[PDB]
A and B are shown apart, each in its own frame.
With several copies, the nearest count.
Chain A
Amino acid sequence: ICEDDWNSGERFTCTVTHTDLPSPLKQTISRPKGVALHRPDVYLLPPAREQLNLR
């Protein structure tokens, strides 16, 4: 698919054709539009002094 198509919120459906299941299941995959963007914050937690005892 194209990058612009995914950002446009188009509805895509994958249909499975399996011999065991008489009914082809429908799975819908789409990017949820209307969500805000936030800047992630990366924090690094060093190990505590109570963990560096058993070596």
Chain B
Amino acid sequence: VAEMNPNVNVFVPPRDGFSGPAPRKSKLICEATNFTPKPITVSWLKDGKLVESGFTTDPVTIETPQTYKVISTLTISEIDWLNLNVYTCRVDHRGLTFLKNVSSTC
């Protein structure tokens, strides 16, 4: 019934978001909302390298055009974050690619 470009949002842990035995680890959340149709592909990129492990994508659930949402979680290491590594969330929708870049730099 409609075609809308998905919105890409990336969540990062704060400075005090790391815990557990050394080395500490955290998670990254990439969520796409208000996109149509239902099918969507979510991928994680780390400094241009595809991540093939340590990630879990939640099933697409329903949030007037029909709307859907998708949640993806990627585990990251504190050491990699301190090296100013850039994490990119790859979203594929109807042949269109949307990339979002986040970093610890201010």
Contacts and interface: CB of A to CB of B under 8 A. Distances in A.
Contacts, number: 14
Interface stretch (B41-49, B53-61, B79-87, B89-97): B79-87
Interface string B63-106: 00000000000000011001110000000000000000000101
Nearest to B15: A22
B47 to A, nearest CB: 14
Interface hub of A17, A19, A22, A24 (most chain B Cβ within 10 A):
A22
A35 to B, nearest CB: 36
A22 B106 CA distance: 7
A17 B8 CA distance: 26
Secondary structure of the A side of the interface?
loop
Contacts of A53: none
* Interface size bracket, A side: under 10
A23 interface: yes
B29 to A, nearest CB: 20
Contacts of B79: 17, 19
A22 B78 contact: no
Contacts of A23: 84
Interface of A: 17-19, 22-24
Interface of B: 78-79, 82-84, 104, 106
14 contacts: A17-B79, A17-B82, A17-B83, A18-B82, A19-B78, A19-B79, A19-B82, A22-B82, A22-B84, A22-B104, A22-B106, A23-B84, A24-B83, A24-B84
